[PDB]
From a paper:
Synpcc7942_2462 from the cyanobacteria Synechococcus elongatus PCC 7942 encodes a putative sugar kinase (SePSK), and this kinase contains 426 amino acids. The At2g21370 gene product from Arabidopsis thaliana, xylulose kinase-1 (AtXK-1), whose mature form contains 436 amino acids, is located in the chloroplast (ChloroP 1.1 Server). SePSK and AtXK-1 display a sequence identity of 44.9%, and belong to the ribulokinase-like carbohydrate kinases, a sub-family of FGGY family carbohydrate kinases. Domain I exhibits a ribonuclease H-like folding pattern, and is responsible for the substrate binding, while domain II possesses an actin-like ATPase domain that binds cofactor ATP.
Apo-AtXK-1 exhibits a folding pattern similar to that of SePSK in line with their high sequence identity. However, superposition of structures of AtXK-1 and SePSK shows some differences, especially at the loop regions. A considerable difference is found in the loop3 linking β3 and α4, which is stretched out in the AtXK-1 structure, while in the SePSK structure, it is bent back towards the inner part. The corresponding residues between these two structures (SePSK-Lys35 and AtXK-1-Lys48) have a distance of 15.4 Å. In contrary, limited increasing of ATP hydrolysis activity was detected for AtXK-1 upon addition of D-ribulose, despite its structural similarity with SePSK. Structural comparison of SePSK and AtXK-1 showed that while the RBL1 binding pocket is conserved, the RBL2 pocket is disrupted in AtXK-1 structure, despite the fact that the residues interacting with RBL2 are highly conserved between the two proteins. In the RBL-SePSK structure, a 2.6 Å hydrogen bond is present between RBL2 and Ser12, while in the AtXK-1 structure this hydrogen bond with the corresponding residue (Ser22) is broken. This break is probably induced by the conformational change of the two β-sheets (β1 and β2), with the result that the linking loop (loop 1) is located further away from the RBL2 binding site.
Numbering used by the authors: 11 to 434
The structure:
């Protein structure tokens, strides 16, 4: 009878999924972020909060009465600064895709070369930028990631984050600590304490049980980032299990017993349980397809493909020059020649070549030290093309299928469940 709520705060709106213990969906829904008042110093944060309340309201009351645990994900490196005593958000959030170049040299002056913080969009660059604006009483401020802040709205215990959200500020999930080069700086006093994703923080606040009818013993758990929640939704849990996201671009994630980080290729690892999620991202993918054909042309041409026969066409499908993974060449040219007169042959060549690139990506992760890929689940638009699925299975020489669930909010609900089970 106990249910488990996960929310996903994405780039333009929030979503929620409520599951039972067996992962069956009892309720789900979405809301776009409302506008905020021009004068609101909170900016987008005020909207996010509104969305939180809206989503909670959207859950059927009979479903809310059964919800035993809550987790949620948010966007990576979306950074808020609060006064520790009042809880006041001291400025507009630093959004996931917002950069603080002004802080990057200082960060490079304390962090290891090619550490993942050494990027203008990193949480740490944002922290250092804010710090250096010398706000009065800044030493009484605290940093929260988007997810941490929304969760804190729910449980009332200030300053807790997770292994995943905290990565871009410099937290090391392997030693479960912030490194001395970070702790040696005064803004380190703003850093949140860090737990594993999907672990209990505290009971849901009485305000929410009173207003929405959640049971008194409902708990609130740490979250994760939306990318990782989305991966979790697939329920790939063993090393060698992989999820390929086939969308506008191509991105892969591979579960591994061994941590892998390599700046040459932009390869980075997050911690999950006792494992490492190793990610890599290519500029190839569906964008060039839809650039070349209509969606109607795409499915109609797809129906004419024999996926069990390989294309002789060697393409590197790109819209413009440049690749970082699985080839580190910022000048890498698109290759779409020769283009056969048959659009079916052309399409087959593109799909097959993207499969080649995907395979090469998994091989590179393996060569960098990851557990070798054994099976590939598929997310993104590309997943609904079964001809492409069969092509990929043949070219990769591995079993390939659709992931069953891919929504971040579904993965967040799995974290809520994990937290409840652990807490029990």
């Amino acid at each position: 009878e106990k249910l488990y709520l996960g929310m996903d705060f994405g780039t333009s709106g929030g979503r929620f999924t409520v599951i039972d213990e067996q992962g069956e969906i009892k309720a789900q829904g979405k809301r776009e972020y409302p506008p905020f008042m021009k004068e609101e110093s909170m900016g987008w944060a005020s909207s996010w909060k509104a969305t939180l309340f809206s989503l909670l309201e959207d859950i059927p009351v009979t479903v809310r009465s059964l919800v035993s645990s809550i987790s949620l994900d948010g966007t990576s490196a979306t950074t808020l600064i609060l006064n520790s005593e009042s809880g006041e958000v001291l400025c507009q959030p630093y959004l996931y895709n917002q950069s603080c170049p002004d802080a990057l040299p200082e960060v490079k002056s304390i962090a290891p070369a090619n550490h993942t913080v050494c990027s203008g969009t990193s949480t740490l660059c944002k922290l250092v930028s804010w710090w250096n604006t010398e706000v009065p009483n800044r030493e009484s401020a605290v940093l929260l990631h988007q997810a941490d802040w929304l969760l804190w709205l729910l449980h009332g215990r200030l300053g807790v984050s997770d292994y995943n959200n905290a990565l871009k500020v410099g937290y090391d999930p392997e030693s479960e600590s912030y490194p001395s080069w970070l702790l040696g700086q005064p803004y380190s006093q703003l850093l949140p304490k860090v737990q594993a994703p999907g672990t209990s923080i505290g009971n849901l606040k009485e305000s929410f049980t009173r207003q929405f009818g959640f049971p008194d013993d409902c708990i609130v758990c740490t979250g994760t980032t939306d990318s990782i929640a989305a991966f979790l939704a697939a329920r790939a849990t063993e090393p060698g299990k992989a999820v390929t996201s086939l969308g506008s671009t191509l991105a892969i994630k591979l579960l591994s017993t061994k941590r892998v980080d390599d700046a040459r290729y932009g390869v980075y690892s997050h911690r999950l349980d006792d494992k490492w999620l190793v990610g890599g991202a290519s500029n190839t993918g569906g964008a060039i397809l839809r650039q070349l054909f209509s969606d109607e042309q795409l499915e109609r041409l797809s129906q004419e493909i024999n996926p069990m026969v390989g294309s002789p066409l060697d393409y590197y499908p790109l819209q413009s020059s440049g690749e970082r993974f699985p080839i580190a060449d910022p000048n890498l040219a698109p290759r779409l020649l020769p283009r056969p007169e048959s659009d079916v042959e052309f399409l087959h060549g593109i799909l097959e070549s993207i499969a080649r690139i995907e395979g090469k990506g998994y091989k590179l992760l393996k060569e960098l030290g990851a557990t070798e890929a054994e099976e590939v689940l598929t997310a993104g638009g590309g997943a609904k093309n079964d001809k492409w699925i069969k092509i990929r299975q043949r070219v990769l020489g591995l079993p390939v299928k659709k992931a069953v669930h891919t929504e971040a909010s579904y993965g967040a609900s799995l974290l809520a469940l994990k937290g409840a089970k652990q807490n029990s």
